[PDB]
Amino acid sequence: ENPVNRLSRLINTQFWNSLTRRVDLNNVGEIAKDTKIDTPGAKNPRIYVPYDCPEQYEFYVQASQMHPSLKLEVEYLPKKITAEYVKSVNDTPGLLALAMEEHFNPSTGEKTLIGYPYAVPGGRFNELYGWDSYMMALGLLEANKTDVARGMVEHFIFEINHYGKILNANRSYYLCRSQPPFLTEMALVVFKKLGGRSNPDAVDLLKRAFQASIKEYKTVWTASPRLDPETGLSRYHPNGLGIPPETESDHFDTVLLPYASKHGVTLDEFKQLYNDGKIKEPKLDEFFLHDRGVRESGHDTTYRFEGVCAYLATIDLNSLLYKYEIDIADFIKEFCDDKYEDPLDHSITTSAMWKEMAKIRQEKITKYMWDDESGFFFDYNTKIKHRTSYESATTFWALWAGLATKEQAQKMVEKALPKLEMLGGLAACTERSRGPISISRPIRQWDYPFGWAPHQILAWEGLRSYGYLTVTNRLAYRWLFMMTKAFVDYNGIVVEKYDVTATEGFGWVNASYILGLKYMNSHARRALGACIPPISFFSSLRPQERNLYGL
| DSSP for 390-412, written as a single string | --BGGGGHHHHHT-S-HHHHHHI
- Give the three-class secondary structure for 155: helix
- Give the three-class secondary structure for 463: helix
- CA 456, 459, 463, 468 dihedral sign is negative
- Give the three-class secondary structure for 177: coil
Q: What distance in Å separates the CA atoms of residue 12 and residue 17, rounded to the nearest whole number?
A: 9
Q: Point out the annotated binding site for substrate.
A: 124, 131-132, 168, 177-179, 246, 295, 298
Q: What distance in Å separates the CA atoms of residue 201 and residue 150, rounded to the nearest whole number?
A: 11
Q: What are 340's strand-pairing partners?
A: 349
Q: Containing H/E element for 114?
A: strand 111-115
Of the candidates 88, 167, 137, 102, the one whose C-alpha atom is nearest the C-alpha of residue 457 is: 137
Q: What distance in Å separates the CA atoms of residue 31 and residue 507, rounded to the nearest whole number?
A: 18
Sequential DSSP letters for 334-358: HHSTT-EE-TTT--EE-HHHHHHHH
Phi, psi of 47 (to 5 degrees): -130, 125
- Integer distance in angstroms from the first to the last C-alpha of the chain? 30
Resolution (Å units):
2.7
CA 241 to chain centre: 23
Q: What distance in Å separates the CA atoms of residue 378 and residue 371, rounded to the nearest whole number?
A: 7
156 contacts 208 by C-beta, under 8 angstroms: no
Q: What are 451's strand-pairing partners?
A: 498
233 contacts 364 by C-beta, under 8 angstroms: yes
394 contacts 314 by C-beta, under 8 angstroms: yes
List of residues 6+ apart from 285 with CB closer than 8 A: none
DSSP 443: P
CA-to-CA dists, residue 5 to 10, 159, 439, 514, 532, angstroms:
8, 37, 42, 10, 16
CA-to-CA dists, residue 112 to 50, 53, 131, 204, angstroms:
19, 15, 30, 21
DSSP 493: -
Q: What distance in Å separates the CA atoms of residue 400 and residue 103, rounded to the nearest whole number?
A: 39
Q: What distance in Å separates the CA atoms of residue 379 and residue 367, rounded to the nearest whole number?
A: 11
Helix pair 132-142, 507-517: axis angle to 10 deg: 50
Q: What distance in Å separates the CA atoms of residue 549 and residue 479, rounded to the nearest whole number?
A: 13
Sequential DSSP letters for 40-99: HHHHS-EEEE-TT-HHHHHHHHHHHHH-GGG--EEEEPPSS--HHHHHHTSSS--EEP--
Q: Containing H/E element for 21?
A: strand 20-21
Q: What distance in Å separates the CA atoms of residue 491 and residue 480, rounded to the nearest whole number?
A: 17
Angle at CA of residue 77, ends 74 and 81, nearest 5°? 150
Omega before residue 454 within 30° of 0, cis: no
Q: What distance in Å separates the CA atoms of residue 120 and residue 133, rounded to the nearest whole number?
A: 8
How many beta carbons lie within 10 A of that of residue 304, not counting itself?
Answer: 27
Of the candidates 366, 373, 381, 376, the one whose C-alpha atom is nearest the C-alpha of residue 412 is: 376
Q: What distance in Å separates the CA atoms of residue 359 and residue 375, rounded to the nearest whole number?
A: 21
The letter for the amino acid at 79 is K
Q: Containing H/E element for 528?
A: helix 522-529
270 contacts 260 by C-beta, under 8 angstroms: yes
List of residues 6+ apart from 186 with CB closer than 8 A: 133, 134, 137, 152, 153, 156, 209
CB burial of 437-459 (b: ≥16 within 10 Å; e: otherwise) equals eeeeeeebebbbbbbbbbbbbbb
Phi, psi of 106 (to 5 degrees): -75, -5
Q: What distance in Å separates the CA atoms of residue 370 and residue 380, rounded to the nearest whole number?
A: 10
How many beta carbons lie within 10 A of that of residue 251, not counting itself?
Answer: 13
Of the candidates 379, 387, 377, 380, the one whose C-alpha atom is nearest the C-alpha of residue 408 is: 377
Interruptions in the chain after residues (C–N over 2.5 Å): 501
Q: Point out the annotated binding site.
A: 124, 131-132, 168, 177-179, 246, 295, 298
- What torsion do the CA atoms of 54, 55, 60, 66 make, to the nearest 10 degrees? 130
Omega before residue 301 within 30° of 0, cis: yes
- Give the three-class secondary structure for 306: coil
Method underlying the structure: X-ray
β-strand 425-426 against 380-381: which pairing, if any? unpaired
User: Helices (DSSP H) in 276-370: which residue ranges?
Assistant: 282-297, 315-335, 351-369
Q: Count CA atoms closer than 13 A to 476's CA, side-chain side.
A: 29
290 contacts 244 by C-beta, under 8 angstroms: no
The letter for the amino acid at 544 is Q
Catalytic residues: 300, 496
Q: What are 47's strand-pairing partners?
A: 74, 95
Q: What distance in Å separates the CA atoms of residue 266 and residue 151, rounded to the nearest whole number?
A: 47
Rg (CA), the chain: 24
